[PDB]
Amino acid sequence: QMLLNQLREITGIQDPSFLHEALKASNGDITQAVSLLTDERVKEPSQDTVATEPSEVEGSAANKEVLAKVIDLTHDNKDDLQAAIALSLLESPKIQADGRDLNRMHEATSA
């Protein structure tokens, strides 16, 4: 009964099955069996134990959270008015000053 007695003595676990299962987990190595049972104090740092005390003042009375964004950029701009304005701006005359079509005109003011 030596392996059960030894492990029990050097872990503290009184449950005979837990002792077998440690020896089973360690594939026979009783030292590893101790290490695996003492994981109760070797686990540290432990899992997410969130260090946050509940706020006594809870303004959030509505348990219902409706998170509905307004990022609907439905611009839906058709190619029709785009290509219309674009065409009208592309045909912009070589007149760079109001109306210089009449460059070198003859006013015909006979005075």
Curated annotation (Swiss-Prot):
Q: How is it modified after translation?
A: Degraded upon nickel ion level or hypoxia exposure. Phosphorylated by PRKD1.
Q: What induces it?
A: Down-regulated upon hypoxia. Up-regulated by the transcription factor c-Jun/JUN in a KRAS-dependent manner in colorectal cancer (CRC) cells.
> Cross-link of type Glycyl lysine isopeptide (Lys-Gly) (interchain with G-Cter in SUMO2): positions?
78
Compartment(s) where it occurs, according to its Swiss-Prot or TrEMBL record = Nucleus, Nucleoplasm
Q: Which residues carry this modification: Phosphoserine?
A: 46
Identify the residues that the record assigns to the UIM domain, covering every copy: 76-95
Location of the region described as Disordered in the Swiss-Prot/TrEMBL record? 39-59
Q: How does it assemble?
A: Interacts with ZNF304. Interacts with PRKD1. Interacts with TP53BP1. Interacts with isoform 1 of FBXW7; following DNA damage, dissociates from FBXW7 leading to degradation of MYC.
Function recorded in the entry:
Deubiquitinase involved in DNA damage response checkpoint and MYC proto-oncogene stability. Involved in DNA damage induced apoptosis by specifically deubiquitinating proteins of the DNA damage pathway such as CLSPN. Also involved in G2 DNA damage checkpoint, by deubiquitinating CLSPN, and preventing its degradation by the anaphase promoting complex/cyclosome (APC/C). In contrast, it does not deubiquitinate PLK1.
**What family does the database annotate?**
Belongs to the peptidase C19 family. USP28 subfamily.
Q: What is this protein called?
A: Ubiquitin carboxyl-terminal hydrolase 28
Give me the gene this protein comes from.
Answer: USP28
Mapped onto the parent protein, the portion here is 22 to 132 of 1077
